Amino acid sequence: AVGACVLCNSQTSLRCGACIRRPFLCCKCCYDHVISTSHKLVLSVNPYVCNAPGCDVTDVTQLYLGGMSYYCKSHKPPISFPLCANGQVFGLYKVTDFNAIATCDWTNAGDYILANTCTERLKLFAAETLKATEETFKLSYGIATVREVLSDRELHLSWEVGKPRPPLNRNYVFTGYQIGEYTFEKDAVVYRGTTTYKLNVGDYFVLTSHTVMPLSAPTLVPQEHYVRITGLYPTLNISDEFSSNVANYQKVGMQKYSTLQGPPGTGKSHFAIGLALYYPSARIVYTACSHAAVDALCEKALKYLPIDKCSRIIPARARVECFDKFKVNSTLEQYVFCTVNALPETTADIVVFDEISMATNYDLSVVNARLRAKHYVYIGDPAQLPAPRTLLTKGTLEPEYFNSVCRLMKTIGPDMFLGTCRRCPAEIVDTVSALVYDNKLKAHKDKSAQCFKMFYKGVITHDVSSAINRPQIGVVREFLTRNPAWRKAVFISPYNSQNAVASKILGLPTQTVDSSQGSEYDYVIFTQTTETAHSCNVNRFNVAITRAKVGILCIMSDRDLYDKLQFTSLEI
Ligand SMILES: CS(=O)(=O)NCCc1ccc(F)cc1
Ligand SMILES: [Zn+2]
Ligand SMILES: [Zn+2]
Ligand SMILES: [Zn+2]
Secondary structure: OOEEOOOOOOEEOOEEOOOOOOOEOOHHHHHHHHOOOOOOOEEOOOEOOOOOOOOOOOOHHHEEEEOOEEEEOOOOOOOOEEOEEOOEEOOOOOOHHHHHHHHOOOOEHHHHHHHHHOOHHHHHHHHHHHHHHHHHHHOOOOOEEEEEEEEOOEEEEEEOOOOOOOOOOOOOOEEEOOOOEEEEEOOOEEEEEOOOOOOOOOOEEEEOOOOOOOOOOOOOOOOOEOOOOOOOOOOOOOOHHHHHHHHHHHHHHOEOEEEEEOOOOOOHHHHHHHHHHHOOOOOEEEEEOOHHHHHHHHHHHHHHOOHHHEEEOOOOOOOOOOOOOOEEOOOOOOEEEEEHHHOOOEEEEEEEEOOHHHOOHHHHHHHHHHEEEEEEEEEEOOOOOOOOOOOOOEOOOOHHHOOHHHHHHHHOOOOEEOOEEOOOOHHHHHHHHHHHOOOOOEEOOOOOOOEEEEEOOOOOEEEOOEEEOHHHHHHHHHHHHHOHHHHHOEEEEOOHHHHHHHHHHHOOOEEEHHHHOOOOEEEEEEEOOOOOHHHHOHHHHHHHHOOEEEEEEEEEOOHHHHHHOOOEEOOO
8 A cells, every 4th residue: 555656756655546547646646636536535555434334425525534543524523634635635755637547538539649748657547547448348348149150150149138249350359158269250240269169059259358467667768868889789791781771770779769760661671670680699679569560570580580599479378370480489589579468578689669650658668667678669650550449439549649659750750761662653652752751751663554543432331330332342343354463452441341342242352451551462452432530541541552562443432532642543
């Protein structure tokens, strides 16, 4: 019961019993919280509650210190001091923002704005509170029981009455019953277990709610600038391949942390792996939120770094298949590749945290808590997609509010910027450069003359809330007959149900905009599907069209983004 105030660090015995996490609040801060919010339960060794038998007064504003015990107005002795008076709550060792974080429901974008504009201490209070709120919300959903098993990838489910049914996408990972994690995709539905199992009727699925651990480290350590490269030893013999990044590699060694904004195909993996070749004796931990982001760093490392000094850290509670070429779970190898949630407690000369738009402040803090490093490098792009905020339903979350790193990149600018896109045909580069890069992204490739746009609203149908546009798929089908080279295209849309329909009608491999991030394909066929805030999001639009190396066909619903596409328009 003795700790430090979450706002001003002043030692105290008081914790807010009404807050979901129970933060310690000093006398002068606890008061300003109880007096401005519905939160009135104050806890010390024992709660501030009326000691009189059978009395239910818990509100600290209605309580007094009667000698050594606590009583309300109705039970206090003659000589009794109010627990609440003179700007303080009585405690040992004798905030408008803390109040909003403590009481919000995390459904508004303004909640996330505050969680990123508040003091560092409140960014951790905000991140822990949010995550606990998200986990308790999983309990709201109804249990899914197997009614019948059709095939090895198809079943029919029975849902709990009186409780809502969770969305059926890859975002929502169930737990079978303890037959391993399972996912669903759309009366026939597609089942997919992280463990292969002969689906038994009666077996049920629940979204696994995980215990939210406390946060201790800041999202960003305090910045330090150095006059020389510190604790790192550069090479003179540096491969011409990486010569373009030498000045930025030196910048990395002359600051405690650095931010790198890398638009699509500008050389983020190449930069990250080249940092290892520039400081050859440095121990580097390569981290990211997703297994796909960590695997892409492994792939680039396989090509340039000694395979014997690499290790892929895999949590024994294996969910999806990941990179199999390095020695597994060797925490002490010079190069360690690991997701944030699986990071061991270790030190490093450099920590490289990739795909930073996908990180939350909870992730930023966990990295600073598990890894003690001489230098930290944050790689990503605030113009790409952030992590899904399952509770957020009102308002759009801007890039400067994704996390502390993205906030810094959008306000003071990134420390380093990769300005040349080597992946995309110039039509795509020119469009996204104007759309989200303030005209600073330059094209390496020429215009491919294989980038097309078609304005076709079609017809929007819905599978629950996930959207389908069958006429936009029909327009694609007609295009494919006339453009057989496009047979090899990856179909992309902002909706899984649209992708399910295009998979059966077109036979192309399918990908949501969100799951395509980090990947590249020679040809992309994109159907916007709808003109909603989701399908019109500039970050999602940016990711969707920058997946293409050679050609792209965009069937658009929104006149605005259609007009912005610097593509050859098609007719039908
Ligand atoms: C119990 S909590 O309020 O939910 N989380 C505390 C986060 C924190 C930890 C250390 C600090 F120096 C500042 C804040
Ligand atoms: Zn409270
Ligand atoms: Zn305080
Ligand atoms: Zn009483």
